[PDB]
Symmetry: D2
Subunit: 326 residues, 4 copies
Amino acid sequence: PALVQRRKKVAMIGSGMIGGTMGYLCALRELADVVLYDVVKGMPEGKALDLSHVTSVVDTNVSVRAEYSYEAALTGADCVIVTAGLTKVPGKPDSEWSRNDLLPFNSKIIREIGQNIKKYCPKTFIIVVTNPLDCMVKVMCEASGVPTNMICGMACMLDSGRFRRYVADALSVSPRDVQATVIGTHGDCMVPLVRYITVNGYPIQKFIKDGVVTEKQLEEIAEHTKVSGGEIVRFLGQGSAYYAPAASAVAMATSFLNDEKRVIPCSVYCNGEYGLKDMFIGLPAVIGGAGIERVIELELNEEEKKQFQKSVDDVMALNKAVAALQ
Amino acid sequence: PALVQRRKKVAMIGSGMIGGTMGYLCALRELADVVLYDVVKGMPEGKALDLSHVTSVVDTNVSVRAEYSYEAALTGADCVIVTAGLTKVPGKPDSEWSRNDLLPFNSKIIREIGQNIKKYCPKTFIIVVTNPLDCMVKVMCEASGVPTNMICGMACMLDSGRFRRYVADALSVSPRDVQATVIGTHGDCMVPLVRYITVNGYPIQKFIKDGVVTEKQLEEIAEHTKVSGGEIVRFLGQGSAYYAPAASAVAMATSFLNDEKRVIPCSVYCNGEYGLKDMFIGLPAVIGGAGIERVIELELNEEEKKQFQKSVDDVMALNKAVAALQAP
Amino acid sequence: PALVQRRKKVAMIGSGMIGGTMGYLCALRELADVVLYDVVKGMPEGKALDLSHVTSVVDTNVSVRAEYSYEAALTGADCVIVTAGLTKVPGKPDSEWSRNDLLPFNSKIIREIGQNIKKYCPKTFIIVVTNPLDCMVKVMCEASGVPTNMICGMACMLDSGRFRRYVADALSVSPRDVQATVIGTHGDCMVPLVRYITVNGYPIQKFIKDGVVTEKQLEEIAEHTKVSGGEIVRFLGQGSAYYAPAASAVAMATSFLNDEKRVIPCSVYCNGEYGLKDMFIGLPAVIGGAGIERVIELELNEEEKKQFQKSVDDVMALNKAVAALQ
Amino acid sequence: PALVQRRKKVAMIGSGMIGGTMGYLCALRELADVVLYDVVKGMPEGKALDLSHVTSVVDTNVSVRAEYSYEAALTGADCVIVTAGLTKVPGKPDSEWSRNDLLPFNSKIIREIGQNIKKYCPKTFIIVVTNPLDCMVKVMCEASGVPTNMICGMACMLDSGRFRRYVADALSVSPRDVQATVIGTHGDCMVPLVRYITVNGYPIQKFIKDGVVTEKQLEEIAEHTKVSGGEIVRFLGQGSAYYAPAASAVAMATSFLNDEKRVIPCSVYCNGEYGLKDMFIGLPAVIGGAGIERVIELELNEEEKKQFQKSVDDVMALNKAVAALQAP
Ligand SMILES: CC(=O)c1ccc[n+]([C@@H]2O[C@H](COP(=O)([O-])OP(=O)(O)OC[C@H]3O[C@@H](n4cnc5c(N)ncnc54)[C@H](O)[C@@H]3O)[C@@H](O)[C@H]2O)c1
Ligand SMILES: CC(=O)c1ccc[n+]([C@@H]2O[C@H](COP(=O)([O-])OP(=O)(O)OC[C@H]3O[C@@H](n4cnc5c(N)ncnc54)[C@H](O)[C@@H]3O)[C@@H](O)[C@H]2O)c1
Ligand SMILES: CC(=O)c1ccc[n+]([C@@H]2O[C@H](COP(=O)([O-])OP(=O)(O)OC[C@H]3O[C@@H](n4cnc5c(N)ncnc54)[C@H](O)[C@@H]3O)[C@@H](O)[C@H]2O)c1
Ligand SMILES: CC(=O)c1ccc[n+]([C@@H]2O[C@H](COP(=O)([O-])OP(=O)(O)OC[C@H]3O[C@@H](n4cnc5c(N)ncnc54)[C@H](O)[C@@H]3O)[C@@H](O)[C@H]2O)c1
Ligand SMILES: O=C([O-])C(=O)[O-]
Ligand SMILES: O=C([O-])C(=O)[O-]
Ligand SMILES: O=C([O-])C(=O)[O-]
Ligand SMILES: O=C([O-])C(=O)[O-]
C-alpha cells in the first residue's frame, strides 16, 4: 500500500575497489539500498549483481543497482560516498607514490560530482574518500553547496585504526579498547597523537612505566602509522588499500544514518579552530543525524603543534594549487 | 561421523532474572549451548523451552536445556556463570536495601557451588555475579580450587557501564566512545574514577574547559553511578537489575570464549597489585582465552587512593568475617 | 544543527515481562529509541534505567525511557507494540489456564490504547500481543481507526517458531532451515500445517520416506506445538512465555522498519480470504515498509479446512462476546 | 598463563579476490584468525595489513597474517578454503568463457595443495572453490586423503543464492524467505529446481495460479541463474564474481565451526545417492561440527532426472580425463 518506512539509500559515486566494498558492507548488514555509479560501463552492473546475490546468501534484503546517469544515481540519496578518481599517477614507480600528485587528475572529477549533487540531492550527507583527501573535500564543498556540517572526508578514522591495531598488538589487547587518534592532513604530514593514547581510558604512560611497551616502540608505531598507506601500495603492486577504507567510510555513514553520535576523527570544516577558516582538515568529530555536530580542538604539545602546522601548510598549499587550476 | 567442532557450553548456575537473560543473549547470538540450573524445579524448564523457541525466531542453532543435578549442569561447561542466591533480604524496606546484608544467605550457596565445580568442571572459567560480589568471588575461589586466573566477578563492567551512559548523555555522544571506569568493591564504596574519564581517549578535562560539562555535573554523575543499583531496586519494587548485569557477564564470557583480550574491569585475584594479596576486588583487567591474562594497576592520586582504601577495608573486613564464621 | 536522520522510535505500551524484553532487543541491536509505558509507576523507570545501562555495555546508542502519559509515550512512535494486560485469570488454577478467559479483563485496556493511538500517532504501525490475541487485534482495529494494512497481531510467528524448533530437533538441522507454519487462531484451535513443512524448500514427505522422522512423530510435534504456551505457563508457575514472544514481535517490527518484506505469519485483517471478512486471524503475510503488504491464502486439504474452521469459530465467538461487553 | 580457549583458524589458500574477501568476512565478524597464502609475493602481506586494520575500525580482534610456506599457512587450520587457481584462460574472449577450460590449468595446483593438507592439517574441513568445481573437489579429496565427510565444494549455495534473489525480486519478498535450490555440477548443466521453489514453505505453483508470476517468468529465472557466472564475467571485464562466492564459502565454514547443521547445497561425496559412487556433485546436505553430516536425496521427475543425468555425465567424463592425465 502506502510506503511508510523507506530504506535508507547510499549512492557510491565511483564503483572501484572501495565503492564495491562499501556496497558489500551495506548488503551484508542490510544498512541501506545501494546505487553503484562509475564512468566505466559494465563493471558496475557486474558488481551490483554479485552484491544482490550476497543478500540471498546472508539472508538480508536491500536493493543493489548500477546507474550510469548522475540523476538516477544521486536522486533520493541519504548519503553520497565519493571514491571516483585515480589512486596512482600513471607511469610513476611505487616508490614515488604520492597522494598529492593525484590533485591534477581528481580535482575536476570531484568538482563535477559536487555540481551534480547540488542539482540532484542538495540535502544529502556527503562523505569524500578521493585523494588528496582534505583538498578534495573543500573542492566538493564549494561545488556541492551543501551546509558545511553536511560534508566530511574519510581519512583519519583509517589512520587511527592503523595506529590502534599496532598499539593493540604491542599491548596484546583488543583494538576495541585502544583509543589512539591521528589528526591533520591525510598524508606524510599526518599527526599521530602518541600522547593521547589510552587503553580503555587508562593513560598509555602507565603502560610504559610498567614496561609493557617502550617509548621508542610507540614512536616507531607512530612512524609505521604515517607510512602504512604507502606500505600497502607497495605490497599490493596495483591500486591501494580498500578493506579498512571501506569499513571506515561506512562506519561514518552509519553514525550519520542511525544518529549514533560516534566520536570519529575525519576531515571537517574549520570554523576558527586553531585559527583555521574556510578549509577542511582532519580533526576528531561527532557524527550524528545532523551531520558533523562537534569538532574537538585538542590541546597540542610542542611537537604536535609543529607537526600539525606542517599538516596545515600541506593542505593550504594544495588548496592554493587547486585554485590555480580552476 | 565424529564431531570435530563442538559448540561452546555455558552453564547458568541459577536460572532467575539474570540467568535466564544471559541464556537469552547466548540464544540470540548463537554464542553457545546453554544449560539452566536452579534449586527451584519446573521454572528453568519453562525458560529453557521459551529460549529454545527463540533460536527458531532468530534463525540460530544452540541447544538450551534445563538440568537438575550439579553433575548434569556443570559437566563439560567451558564457562560457568553463577547467579544463584538472594537479591533482597526478606521483610526489609527497599530504602534499607544493602548488598552486604546478603552475606549470611549467599555464602553457603556460593561455597556449595564451588565444591561442585571442583568436582565436575575444574577446568572451567568461572564468572560470579551473586552479591555481595567481591566476597562471593573469594568464597567461590576457595571452594572451587580453580587457578586464580580462571575466576572473576562481574560488577565493575556494569558500574562502568552506568557511569558511561550518564557521561554519554551529558556529552551527547555514543557510550561506545566514553571510557569511564569504576574500581573497588561493588557497593557504596565503589570508586568512580572521574579524573580518568575519556571521550575516545580525549581527557574529560577538555570538555570541562570547553564548557560542555562541569566538575559538579561529573561528581553528581559519579554519585548516581554509586547509587544506581539501589535506585533500580526501589523503582522495580521486586528484585534488582538484570538486563545490563546479564549483558556484562556475557560480554566477559565472550571475551574469554573468543580470546578477544578485551580490557574489562572486574573483580580479580590480587597478588601484589595496589599492595593487595589473597583477595579479589574490582580492577581493570584483560580477559582472554587464558582467562584473566592481565591485572592493570592505575596510578591513583591521594584522594583516589583514599576512596579505594575504604573499598579495600570493606571487603577485607567482610572476608575475615566470612572466614571466621565458616563451617569446618 | 538541524536533525536530518532521526532514529526510529518504538513505544512499548505495557512494560511487563514482554515489553521489557522487546526494549532489551531494541537496545542490544541499536534498532530504535525506546519508550516504556505502563499503568504501574516506578517499575518502567527501573527497567528504562537498566536498559539504558545496556547500551553502554554493548556499545550502542539509543534512548530508552519511561513515560507515564499516553501523549508522551505515543507521540512520534513509528511502531507501537501493545502487551498491556493480564496473562492469567486471578485465582484460577494453572491447570485451567485459558487465553479466552482473559477477554473480560483485557478488552477495555486494548480499546483505550487504541483510542489514544488514534489521537497521538495515527500513522504508526500497531503490533498487538495482548491475549486473546486475534480478538484483541479486532478491538484495537475498531478503536484505533488506522489503515487495515497498518495493524496486526503477533502470535503465529511464535507458534511457528515452536513448530520449527521441534521439527529442527527431530531432523538434527538448524531451525533456520525449517519452514513450518501455524495459521488460525492463537489457541487450542491453532492449526500447525504439518503438510506444509519443508526443509530448505524440500518436502517433509521425503524425510519421512528416508526414515528421518515418522508421520506419527510429526503429528506429536503438531500437538506439542498447540500446547506449548500452557506447557510453559505450567513450568513457570507465574506468568507466561516472554523471550520468544518478544523476539517474534521485534522481528515483525524490524521487517516493517527496514522494509524487509519478510514472510511472517501473523494476525491480519481479512478482506475475503477463506470467506473471512471484517475480522483478524493468523495467516502468512508479507510485512514491509507499507505494513501488511500481502496476505497469503494457502490451499487447505480436508483435515486442514476442518481444523481451520474450528479456529475461525473460536475467534468469531470471541468477537461476538466482545461486542456484547462493549 | 595457559591458553584454554584458542580462536578458530581459517586458512585462505589463494589470496586473490575471493580469498581476500573471505578474510574480510572473518575480520568483520570476528569469526577466526586468518592466514592469507598465495604464490604471488607481497600481495598477501598488503591484504593482511589492510584486513588487520579493519579489526580496529569494526572493533573486533582476530589475527590476520600472510604466510608464504604451506606449513605456516596450513598448520593448526580448523578449516581450509581453497581458491588458488585461474579464473579465465588467457587470450580467450569473454564470450567464450567456460569453467571446464580451466581444468588443465588448475588440476595440478589443487592436487599439490591437497598433498600439503594431508601432511600439515589432516583433521581440517576442506572447502574447495576453484573451478571447475566438482572435478576439483574430487582431486582435492584424493590428494588430501581426508575423510569424505571432511571435504566439500562451494557452488550450489552461490547458484541457489542467485536463484533466490531473482525469485525474491519477482515476488517482492525477502530472499530469506525464498527456498530455491540448484543441484548438479556448477556449470551450464546445473539444475535450477523450479518445481521445488517455495516461499517460506509455500509452493511456487500457488503464486503462478494466483497470477503473481508466470511459467515463462520462472523459466527465465532458471535460465538467468545458469548464466549468472558468465554474465558477471562479461560485465566485469577482468576476473569473475567474488562477493557472493566469498559469503557462500564462509557461511559453509561457519556452519561447520559453530556446528549449526544448516542445510546447504554443496559439492559432496556420493555413496549411492541418485546411484552415484566415488565422485562429488552438488546436492543438498547438512553441514555441522562433523562436516557433511547428511546428504539429501530429492525425488526428481523425468525432466529433472534428464537434466541431472546430463550434469552427472559431464563431471564423470572430466573426472575420468583428469585421472588419465594426472602426474605420478
Ligand atoms: C583518504 C583515504 O584514507 C583513502 C584510502 C584509500 C584510497 N583513497 C582514495 O580513494 C579513491 C578510490 O580508491 P579505489 O576505489 O581503490 O580506486 P579504484 O579501484 O581505481 O576506483 C576508482 C573508481 O572511480 C572511477 N572513476 C574515475 N573517474 C570517475 C568519474 N568522473 N566519475 C565516477 N567514477 C569515476 C574509476 O573508473 C574507478 O572505478 C582513490 O582516489 C584513492 O587514492 C583514499
Ligand atoms: C555484581 C553485580 O553487578 C550484580 C547485579 C545484579 C544482581 N546481582 C546479584 O546476582 C544475584 C542474582 O540476581 P537475579 O538473577 O536477579 O536473582 P533471582 O531472580 O532471585 O534469581 C536467583 C536464582 O537463584 C536460585 N537459587 C537460590 N539458591 C540456589 C542454590 N543453592 N542453588 C542454585 N540456585 C539457587 C533462585 O531459586 C533463583 O532462581 C543476586 O545475588 C543479586 O544481588 C549482582
Ligand atoms: C499472542 C502470544 O503469543 C502471547 C505470548 C505471551 C504472552 N501474551 C500475552 O501478552 C500480554 C503480556 O504478557 P507479559 O508481558 O508477559 O505480562 P506481564 O508481565 O503481566 O505484563 C503485562 C503488563 O501490562 C501492564 N498493564 C495492565 N493494564 C495496563 C493498562 N491499562 N495500560 C498499560 N499497561 C497495563 C501490567 O501492569 C504489566 O506491566 C498478556 O496479555 C499475555 O497473555 C501473548
Ligand atoms: C564454484 C564457484 O561458485 C566459484 C565462483 C567464483 C569463482 N570460482 C573460482 O574460484 C577461483 C578463484 O577466483 P578469484 O579469487 O576471483 O581469482 P583470483 O583473484 O585470480 O585469485 C586466484 C589466486 O590464486 C593464486 N594462485 C595461483 N596458483 C596458486 C598456487 N599454486 N598456490 C596458491 N595460490 C595460487 C593466484 O596468484 C591468485 O592470487 C577461480 O578458479 C574461479 O573460477 C568458483
Ligand atoms: O590514502 C591511502 O591510499 C591510504 O592511506 O591507504
Ligand atoms: O548489585 C546490584 O544489584 C546492582 O548494582 O544492580
Ligand atoms: O499466548 C501464550 O501465552 C503463549 O502461547 O505463549
Ligand atoms: O563459477 C563462477 O565463476 C561463477 O559462477 O561465479
